[PDB]
């Protein structure tokens, strides 16, 4: 459950804002004014997405196309939460975990 929460926290940062990529020619190296300008463009795409992007005719700003939708991890979270509450030996009605599964009809001579 903890590892899956960290996977969702790493996945939403990709599927909700999109990782930016930017291609420059080889003339620009690190520590230059153009390098700082490219840093400023990427930082403004992350932080202030309303100043827009203004590029020279050689630079190709793009988002990295993951080419797949984000898979629904909610059933896996409910599965491991069901595993915890099942290992504790308690029904899913007292602890609030009854989510779309049917209520108990009559039950047995006693409950769980």
């Amino acid at each position: 459950k903890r590892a899956l929460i960290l996977l969702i926290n790493h996945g939403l940062e990709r599927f909700m804002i999109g990782v930016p990529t930017l291609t420059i020619p080889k003339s620009v190296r690190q520590g230059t004014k153009q390098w700082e300008a490219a840093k400023e463009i990427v930082k403004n795409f992350v932080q202030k997405p309303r100043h827009g992007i203004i590029l020279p005719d050689d630079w190709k700003f793009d988002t990295v196309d993951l080419k797949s939708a984000m898979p629904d991890a909610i059933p896996y979270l409910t599965y491991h939460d069901a595993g915890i509450a099942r290992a504790l030996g308690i029904d899913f009605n007292t602890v609030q975990l009854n989510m779309g599964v049917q209520a108990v009809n009559i039950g047995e001579f006693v409950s769980l």
């Binding site: 595993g83 915890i84 099942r86 290992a87 030996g89 006693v110 769980l112």
Partner: protein
């Protein structure tokens, strides 16, 4: 008759040896798997429910007849077991 001339034979065959055919579950290595299955939520839940429902079965000693000797030895072994919780 004289007696039982027929011995209690094994349940063994060429592959199945003593009610088991898997070599992983053959000897005491199967006890390791049976102990590691206690780390499951489903298995421990079912075992806790079944054993707790066994422990609240309302047991009672039933004697042999209505003779006071049978009632005496029944109450004797009832005190030996302690069906009432503590002793």
């Amino acid at each position: 008759l004289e007696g039982a001339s027929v011995p209690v034979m094994s349940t063994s065959y060429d592959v199945v040896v003593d009610r088991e055919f898997d070599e992983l579950l053959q000897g005491k290595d199967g006890l390791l798997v049976y102990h590691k299955m206690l780390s499951d939520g489903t298995v421990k839940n079912a075992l806790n429910y079944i054993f707790g429902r066994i422990r609240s079965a309302k047991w009672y000693v039933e004697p042999a007849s209505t003779d006071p000797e049978d009632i005496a030895i029944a109450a004797f072994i009832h005190a030996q077991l302690g069906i009432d919780d503590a002793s």
